[PDB]
């Protein structure tokens, strides 16, 4: 049946003649079909959130009804594309319209049906077999790097009646046929899935593997794990976007979904200009990371409502690629944008506001979003195991941490990376506040180090106490000048200064520091802690001597060694073997031991 | 008892988030239970909240999704929510709504009881007196707990309150039934907490004597309103029809208050403080007044909720109103956890009603309470000296200030510092306190009575 528009106010639309309507149903509004969703019903009137711009819509326009909620489509060719807030193949749209702009009511299929793919049947599938859904039954070489694997969705079962042979096949072509209770249902390479649902899993598993990031401070102090949840609140302008981009470029994962909500398109164009050139190596084959990434951007100026659809679509795609049987992670950008969109929608609906104008159920929705991450055992008789990591970015107003958004966010996430604007103002680009950040995954990783980096475990511990003592002494420095402290205090201050200047500072744009391998980091930390140990031993041994050594004597005696310590980080990973770097660090350590022996 | 054929309607006249409005219902009953059928085969349940003329307001515990106007059906029961109750509920885990979540069957109905419970005469309550050994020097001593008391825990985000819960579970006992039956319920928590609790209980062999309710963050929030009462009804049945002593744990009441806020905002009632409904005070009074002994019977309930803290404001509405109902409160401090103290507990904000419980005549010993008070005063003065030192240099310090500081570091590093599984006898804790006291010369211990000073100081 049909509906007729009764009233309009911004991105909301009141309608009539909706007696048979159901809520969270899709609807198409106006002469130019605009996607929508139901939120509220009274009598036969209804309320509709419109994901497109609202303009030119008059009273009485047709309102077509569909019997499905919001949903997306899954299959080959998704990798490497770009999508609007709803599933829409942006590149195909620009080619189709042959125009710069995006028409308001444009309609394009999610994935082109005219692209063949080389499907191979699974070798174990015989006629008459049963798979009970959620099971791989094929494979596809959609691109050179990743092998896309077709799987029947759950809630489906039956006996096999036909399997296509290997060969080339376009989309929307029947491949598998099953017959469960005398009724034969066909299937194509493309499935569908409701957005607001959650794909079930065989089981969940505990976090047990580290997620190397390449950044020194994060990997040395507050590491994340695969399957983990992270949050990075920051003042307005701290390079959070850069942290997200660096993480995407140098993760350990296999497929990365970058969802930029409420952002400037210039970053997207920069990413498109950069990713194709940057490459990486799998099994001796070098190819661009753009193939193992997918993009979904919703520029700020776009309609406000589409932000929530963007956020949900990201997690749905990542969950599909989790069932796919890989490790993946996503860059969720500026959830506060989704919060603001929800605030506007609720305010237009005249609900009872909660703290700071945001509606009450913001926290509940954030929880429903965040729990969908973790390591899992998947459906499908061939045994599969994957994981999904969330990396949210938050931008509280005024740079304060009192607004309800961050307060709700911190109540769920397990690891927290606060960013301090003062560091950013003094060009300390990885602006991490070590004093307030905390990671709850300090456990469940000691064994990984036991089998790889056993020596590393106490080093970071010692680093933490030296920084803490520096903080406790800093105010006494501020209110009371120097020359009132023992030599141990002064040398600890110096060691903290060296730690800040070198171990913490990382410039992601330089060739020599665009990415830090772990061995480089642990070598640096070992060198610094060895220096601190030797210096403290030297001063305490001579504490009771008539020729007690002072900081000035040490500094003059081995200042060149201090320059070497500062300059050790100017080594590339490429064009420089790991053995060479380790040899240089050992040689520097030996020089330091010689300098301490000479005293 | 019996009833008549139930009524059914297809008159859904409204839908507003978690609420549904109906019309033309004959003789509605307040707080009745209903069953909803969606256009598909799914089935749900709800509860009535308002009635006027022929209008019925209901709330759906399973969230609202797929509801329409012309196809949805509703059914009307006879009475209020009455839940099954059995002694076999031990060893059985459920979800928030009480439906079995493990692979086992529906609970056999030994007896039906009212979820809301029943008021108890103040005459019939018996004052709790049996002090409890917790094996934690921080808890015992300054904040010992009698059986029947209702102390909460205060915890900011990212602090190890869960480990405190596990530690108090494993260390439950009495000063010398040999254990307690644990009725533990969780409100909107991540999978890690549930795994931790289940694994810890399984390792200690306590599945035989624990009943769990699990409400996770991904489940609809509306059932959080019912879940705590579903725990407490079972608790009080075990405490007043089996004479079994019970330690009932709740956690993260902030989510319960949030659910109340959802309902109130949906109902457009006059907000009070920070969007919380005004009568939520009475609501919390209702949910906390289910402990204490009673004559003619044996057994009791010891109520220990955990409270997640918005930011760190002690003066936030939730902690304030919980402070007016619970006799005491234990405080978890962020600074101590920053300084790597496994039980990060600040004694200063903490307080309990032990003045009549732990005395010594049959309890630990005579000098107990005096020792505790003296330690508390000494710690307060030590913190004052610490504040003084942050202003001026070390030169202005006298002998007293150095003594106080030194006492502060020793007490922080030895008394409070205590690894997990490290059960400590109460007498050992008092001996440690005496060792700390011996540092100061005997003259400055003003609170101590003279006889005790002569007896125990040397």
């Amino acid at each position: 049946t049909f509906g007729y528009v009764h009233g309009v106010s911004g991105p909301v639309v009141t309608a009539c003649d909706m007696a048979g309507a159901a809520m969270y149903e899709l609807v198409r509004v106006g002469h130019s079909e605009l996607v929508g969703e139901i939120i509220r019903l009274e009598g036969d009137m209804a309320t509709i959130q419109v994901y497109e711009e609202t303009s030119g819509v008059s009273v009485g326009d047709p309102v077509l009804r569909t019997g499905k909620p919001l949903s997306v489509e899954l299959g080959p060719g998704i990798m490497g594309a770009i999508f609007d807030g709803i599933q829409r193949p942006l590149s195909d749209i620009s080619s189709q319209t042959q125009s710069i702009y995006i028409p308001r009511g444009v309609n394009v299929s999610a994935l082109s049906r005219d692209i063949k793919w080389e499907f191979i049947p699974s070798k174990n599938l015989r006629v008459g077999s049963h798979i009970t859904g959620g099971d791989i039954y094929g494979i596809v070489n959609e691109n050179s790097l990743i092998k896309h694997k077709i799987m029947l969705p759950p809630r489906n079962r039956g006996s096999v009646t036909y399997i296509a042979p290997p060969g080339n096949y376009d989309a929307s072509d029947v491949v598998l046929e099953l017959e469960f209770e005398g009724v034969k249902e066909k299937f194509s390479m493309v499935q569908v899935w409701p957005v607001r649902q959650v794909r079930p899993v065989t089981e969940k598993l505990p976090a047990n593997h580290p997620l190397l990031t390449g950044q020194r401070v994060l990997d040395a102090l507050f590491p994340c794990v695969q399957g983990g949840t992270t949050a990075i609140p920051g003042a307005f302008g701290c390079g959070k976007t850069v942290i997200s981009q660096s993480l995407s470029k140098y993760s350990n994962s296999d497929v990365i979904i970058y969802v930029g909500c409420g952002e400037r398109g210039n970053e997207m164009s920069e990413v498109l200009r950069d990713f194709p050139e940057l490459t990486m190596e799998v099994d001796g084959k070098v190819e661009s990371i753009m193939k193992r990434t997918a993009l979904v951007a919703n520029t700020s100026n776009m309609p406000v409502a589409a932000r929530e659809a963007s956020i949900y679509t990201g997690i749905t795609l990542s969950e599909y690629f989790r069932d796919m049987g890989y490790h993946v992670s996503m860059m969720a950008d500026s959830t506060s944008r989704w919060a603001e969109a929800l605030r506007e929608i609720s305010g237009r609906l005249a609900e009872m506001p909660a703290d700071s104008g945001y509606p009450a159920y913001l926290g509940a929705r954030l929880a429903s979003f965040y729990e969908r991450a973790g390591r899992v055992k998947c459906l499908g008789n061939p045994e599969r195991e994957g994981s999904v990591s969330i990396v949210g970015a938050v931008s509280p107003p005024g740079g304060d941490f009192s607004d309800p958004v961050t307060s709700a966010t911190l109540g769920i996430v397990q690891v927290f990376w606060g960013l301090d604007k003062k560091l950013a103002q003094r060009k300390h680009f990885p602006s991490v506040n070590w004093l307030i950040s905390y990671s709850k995954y300090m456990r469940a990783l000691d064994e990984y180090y036991d089998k790889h980096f056993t020596e590393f475990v106490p080093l970071r511990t010692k680093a933490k106490e030296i920084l803490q003592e520096e903080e406790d002494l800093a105010e006494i420095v501020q209110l009371v000048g120097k020359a009132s402290l023992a030599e141990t205090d002064k040398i600890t201050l110096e060691v903290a200064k060296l730690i800040k200047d070198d171990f913490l500072q990382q410039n992601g744009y330089t060739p020599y520091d665009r990415f830090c391998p772990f061995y480089k980091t642990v070598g640096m930390l070992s060198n610094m802690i060895s220096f601190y140990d030797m210096a403290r031993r030297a001063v305490e041994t001579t504490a009771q001597s008539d020729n007690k050594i002072t900081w000035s004597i040490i500094r003059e005696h081995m200042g060149e060694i201090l320059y070497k310590l500062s300059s050790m980080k100017f080594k590339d990973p490429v064009k420089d073997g790991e053995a060479k770097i380790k040899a240089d660090y050992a040689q520097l350590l030996e020089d330091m031991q010689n300098a301490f022996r000479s005293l | 008892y019996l009833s008549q054929p139930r009524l059914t309607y297809k008159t859904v006249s409204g839908v507003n988030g978690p609420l549904v409005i109906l019309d033309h219902v004959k003789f509605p009953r307040y707080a009745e239970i209903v069953h909803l059928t969606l256009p598909d085969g799914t089935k749900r349940s709800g509860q009535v909240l308002e009635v006027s003329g022929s209008k019925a307001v209901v709330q759906v515990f399973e969230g609202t999704s797929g509801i329409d106007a012309k196809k949805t059906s509703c059914e009307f029961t006879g009475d209020i929510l009455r839940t099954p109750v059995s002694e076999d509920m031990l060893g059985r885990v459920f979800n928030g709504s009480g439906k079995p979540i493990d692979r086992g069957p529906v609970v056999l109905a030994e007896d039906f009881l009212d979820i809301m419970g029943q008021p108890i005469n103040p005459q019939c309550r018996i004052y709790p007196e049996e002090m409890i050994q917790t094996g934690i020097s921080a808890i015992d001593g300054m904040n010992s707990i009698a059986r029947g008391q209702k102390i909460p825990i205060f915890s900011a985000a990212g602090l190890p309150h869960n480990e405190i819960a596990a530690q108090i579970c494993r260390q439950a006992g009495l000063v010398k039934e040999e254990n307690f039956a644990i009725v533990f319920a969780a409100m909107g928590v991540n999978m890690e907490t549930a795994r931790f609790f289940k694994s810890d209980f399984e390792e200690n062999g306590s599945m035989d004597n624990v009943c769990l309710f699990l409400n996770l963050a991904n489940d609809p929030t509306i059932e959080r309103i019912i879940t705590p009462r579903l725990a407490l009804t079972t608790a009080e049945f075990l405490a007043y029809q089996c004479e079994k002593h019970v330690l009932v744990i709740l956690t993260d009441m902030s989510s319960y208050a949030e659910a109340l806020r959802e309902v109130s905002a949906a109902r457009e009632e006059v907000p009070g403080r920070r969007g919380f409904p005004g009568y939520m005070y009475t609501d919390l009074a209702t949910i906390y007044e289910r402990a204490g002994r009673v004559e003619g019977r044996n057994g009791s309930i010891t109520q220990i909720p955990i409270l997640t803290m918005p930011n760190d404001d002690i003066t936030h509405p939730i902690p304030d109103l919980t402070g007016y109902i619970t006799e005491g409160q234990i405080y978890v401090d962020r600074q101590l956890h920053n300084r790597q103290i496994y039980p990060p507990i600040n004694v200063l904000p903490s307080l309990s009603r032990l003045m009549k419980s732990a005395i010594g005549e049959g309890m630990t010993r005579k000098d107990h309470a005096d020792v505790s008070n003296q330690l508390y005063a000494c710690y307060a003065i030590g913190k004052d000296v610490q504040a003084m030192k942050a202003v001026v240099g070390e030169e202005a310090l006298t002998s007293d200030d150095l003594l106080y500081l030194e006492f502060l570091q020793k007490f922080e590093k030895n008394f409070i510092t205590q690894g997990p599984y490290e059960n400590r006898t109460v007498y050992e804790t008092l001996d440690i306190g005496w060792q700390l006291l011996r540092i100061f010369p005997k003259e400055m211990l003003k609170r101590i009575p003279q006889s005790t000073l002569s007896e125990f100081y040397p």
Partner: peptide
């Protein structure tokens, strides 16, 4: 103040 304005607005019906 905004909460009170809203409740009065709704009460006007």
């Amino acid at each position: 103040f905004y909460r009170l304005k809203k409740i009065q607005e709704k009460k006007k019906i």
